[PDB]
Amino acid sequence: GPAFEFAVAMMKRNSSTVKTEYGEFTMLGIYDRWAVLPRHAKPGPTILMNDQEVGVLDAKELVDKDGTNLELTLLKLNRNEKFRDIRGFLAKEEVEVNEAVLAINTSKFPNMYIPVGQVTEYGFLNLGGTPTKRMLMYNFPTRAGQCGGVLMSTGKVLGIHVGGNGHQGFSAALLKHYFN
Ligand SMILES: *[C@H](CC(=O)OC)[C@@H](C[C@@H]1CCNC1=O)NC(=O)[C@H](CC(C)C)NC(=O)OCc1ccccc1
């Protein structure tokens, strides 16, 4: 319940629907002009954001100290409107909760919310043939078209959905030090 009400408030304020040449994604703005997409969104020099073309000033494919994939891409957008600073909702390490929701905002899933239930720190995962770390896991049959969805519990933004088998979901932890 409370995690659901928090998600709807957060997605109305900070989320948008983004199209790259590789698909449609939920995008979460973090602070200033910095937002986060799953790495496989592979944004080019311009993206489509709320159906309007937006130039990309920089894109950082996040990787740990040994070069291990984190399945996160940080982009600075060439636009004047600043994002509401939600870095205080970002934890310093991988968050576990008992009740979380996954929130999605694309043409295929418009403002759709999801009772993932328990979220635990998974860690390493061979994700699509790519060794990846800092994964968060939930037991929900997550679908395609859902990557970029924002994993949240009440008062917390846990990470970004990046993959899943048939009956499991996996999020890349959205950590505070990623954005200074
Ligand atoms: C991203 C789909 C999307 O939004 O594309 C526009 C999701 C969906 C998955 C697949 C079904 N359940 C989901 O939620 N992620 C993927 O498709 C990823 C892509 C990688 C490049 C990150 N692949 C994936 O989930 O592979 C399945 C898997 C294999 C091994 C271990 C875990 C999952």
Author numbering: 1 to 180
Quote from the publication.
Among them, we have the proteases encoded by the 3C region of the enteroviruses genome (3CPro, hereafter), such as Coxsackievirus B3 (CVB3), EV-D68, EV-A71 and Coxsackievirus A16. The fact that all these virally encoded proteases from coronaviruses and enteroviruses perform essential functions in the viral replication cycle by cleaving both viral and host targets, as well as the fact that there is no known human protease with a specificity for Gln at the cleavage site of the substrate, has pushed the scientific community towards the development of a commercially viable antiviral drug targeting both of these virus families. While this dimerization is essential for the catalytic activity of 3CLPro, the enteroviral 3Cpro functions as a monomer. The structure of CVB3-3Cpro adopts a chymotrypsin protein fold.
The crystal structure of CVB3 3CPro in complex with the GC-376 PROTAC precursor was solved at 1.9 Å resolution, which provided atomic details of the CVB3 3CPro–ligand interactions. The N-terminus starts with an α-helix of residues 1–14 and is followed by two topologically equivalent β-barrels comprising residues 15–77 and 100–173, which pack together to form a narrow groove for substrate binding. The catalytic triad of Cys147, His40 and Glu71 is located in the cleft between the two β-barrels. The most relevant feature is the binding mode of the ligand to the catalytic Cys147, which occurs via a covalent bond between C5 and the sulfur atom of Cys147. From a crystallographic point of view, this is supported by the fact that the bond length spontaneously refines to values around 1.8 Å, which is coherent with a C-S covalent bond. The protein atoms involved in direct hydrogen bond interactions with the ligand are, namely, the backbone oxygen of Thr142, one of the imidazole nitrogen atoms of His161, the backbone oxygen of Val162, the backbone nitrogen atom of Gly164 and the backbone nitrogen atom of Cys147. The only exception is the conformation of the phenyl ring of the benzyloxycarbonyl group, which is basically flipped by 90°. This effect is due to a different structural arrangement of the C-terminal segment of CVB3 3CPro with respect to that of SARS-CoV-2 3CLPro, which makes the substrate cavity of CVB3 3CPro more open. The larger available volume allows the phenyl ring to rotate in a position that is structurally more congested in the structure of SARS-CoV-2 3CLPro.
